[PDB]
Amino acid sequence: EFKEQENIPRQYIENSPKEELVLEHVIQFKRQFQYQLYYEDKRDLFLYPK
Amino acid sequence: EAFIQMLDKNLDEAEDQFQIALRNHLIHIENLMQLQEARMRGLAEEFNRD
């Protein structure tokens, strides 16, 4: 319902360019973490909520 | 007489190509001026946006 307000804040619908670049860096670090953690079981680095 | 006319027809052609060279030089200076205007206008725009 909070997204059901007629004037959804623009900040809640699109992330700034730096926010997306930070997301890309987070995905990159997650990929590196998986690549170098061949021995340890996956643990949810919940870095990209919705 | 035909040589003097040619001395001023050979010279007429020569003068025509000196006029051509001057027109080309003025055109080249005009393009230099246009693109220098482009650079200065870009500088002013970036400075005033900042």
Next chain:
Amino acid sequence: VYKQKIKHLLFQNQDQQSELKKDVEVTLKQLEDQHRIKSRELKTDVRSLKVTK
């Protein structure tokens, strides 16, 4: 004939000088655009942290 030919391949000189001028201008434009992008990102970070401060 030879004088006009000097008013020619000098045409090669003109074409290649224009090539180098436009290459220098375009690389300058690329580098300046990169500078401006990084400048605005850094200023955004500075402003966001100044707001917090």
Next chain:
Amino acid sequence: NWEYVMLDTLLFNKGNGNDEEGNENIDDPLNKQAQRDPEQEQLQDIAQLL
């Protein structure tokens, strides 16, 4: 034991905050021209921080 996802500038840029006690020798900067490692600046510049 604990790994940091991001390398921030807090640690690397606090060296020049140590001139708090300065009321002492005015040692001539003629002998303080140590050649800064080109590696430091180059890797600071090419591996741009997020």
Next chain:
Amino acid sequence: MNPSQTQKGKIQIQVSRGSIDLLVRTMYEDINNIKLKNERFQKKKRAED
């Protein structure tokens, strides 16, 4: 409120306009007079030939 404190925009924009005009003068002090001489030679030789 301090009148000077609250009006940064106009004063800085005035400074910017002054800088723009001063630069225009400096860059304009040394260009475009060549075309005048070239065209005057052109028209003199026009009236001549």
Next chain:
Amino acid sequence: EQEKSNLNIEDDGKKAKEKEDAYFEDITKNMKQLKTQLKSEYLEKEKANIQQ
């Protein structure tokens, strides 16, 4: 003529590159020095606030 003019044009480009690099690096140094007044100076000021 072509060699000299091309070399001069490319030296013009390279000196422009050096000038622009110095300019941008000066601006980046200003921005990062100011930002250091927002993260490191932030913790220093927090220490000052708590002590006061």
Next chain:
Amino acid sequence: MLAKKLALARSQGKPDPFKKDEFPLLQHIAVEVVSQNYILYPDLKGVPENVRDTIISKITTDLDILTMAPNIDQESFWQRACKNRWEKSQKSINIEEHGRSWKVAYLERYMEEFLTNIQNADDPNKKQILQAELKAAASWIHTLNLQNINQNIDIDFICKYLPLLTSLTLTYGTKYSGMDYNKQSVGMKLSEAANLGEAIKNCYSLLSLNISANMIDDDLLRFIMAGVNMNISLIELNLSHNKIEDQGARRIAKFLMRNEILLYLNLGNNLIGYEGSRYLAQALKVNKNLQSLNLKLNNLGDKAGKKLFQDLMLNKTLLELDVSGNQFEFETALKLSDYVADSMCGLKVLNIANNDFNDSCYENLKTGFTKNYSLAKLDLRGNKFSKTQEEKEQELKDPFRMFNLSQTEKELTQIIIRHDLTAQKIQFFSESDLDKIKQLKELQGAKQEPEKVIQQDQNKE
């Protein structure tokens, strides 16, 4: 090859050298073949766009234009082709100037260089292939541009296939002028002028024509206009650096009388006399849609300019003026001051350079130039007006310092800028204003420090 490697591995029954997950899917091999065998697959009909972009990215950049244009519209691919072709060429495409499409700019450049490299375009197979290429390009053709051509080009045959061309640029020259001296190698001749005019009259949606650098004279301009007379879409005509004589000027005046839609006009650098000046002034006085008058690099004469200013009194649309170098003097100066004194003038561009004015006109120009409000910019350098001794010192020391503006030219420019920027609600800091501000700031800086000295030495007691 994968079958070959599998057979090699089985040749002994040893442990598997290829992992199960190391086997690419049928999609990998199919896309590899398509990228290598796109000739058999110009269509890819029914293949999702995802694989299409995959193949495009994984393909090289030497594809055929006729086939790439219809089946390919992926911009990064066109940039790949641009990198493969013109990265080290003379120039690279400027995107904003090519409809925001890499493909269109690449296509237009390849058209330029093909029509250049083309030898004897009348050759049957070459002409048929050219027709086919124009037909294929009919979807994405916007502008046509050629400088320094060396062929008696048939304009109409090409134009008939291009009702979408937005701008046309034709300039005569010698792109490959061999050793031999050919004065006829430079300068557009009768047949090409007639054909280009005929193609102009065979158009529906053309937006601008530039026949500049063609040395166009009255005879050739006549064919050009006769082509341009009946067509009903021309908006821009460029005719600077041509051989326009008096007949061309009279025909220009007649067309201005007849013109209803033209928006850009260039007619500088010609051989027009006073008759042409009178005709142009009369044509533009009744004109109400033409924007700028281009009469620079001309020889109008003081009477010509005076007559033009007298005619343009009724005009209310000529706003960009570029008539530098027509030998206008005191008479023209007073007449133009009288013109500017009116409140009905909306001129935006004023190019009156390359004149022979004198100091005596001050009381007029200033006076008349004291009556200008809506104007923006004007050119006044290179005059022989009252020159200060230091100015002459600067020209003697520095020939490139001969370009220094005279004080009166700067005064008129300052007055115009003051009125314009007050129109834009801008306060002014001229040389005197800058001096005042700087001296005031230095005064404050000097007066602030001794207070510091006294208050600091206040703590020494």
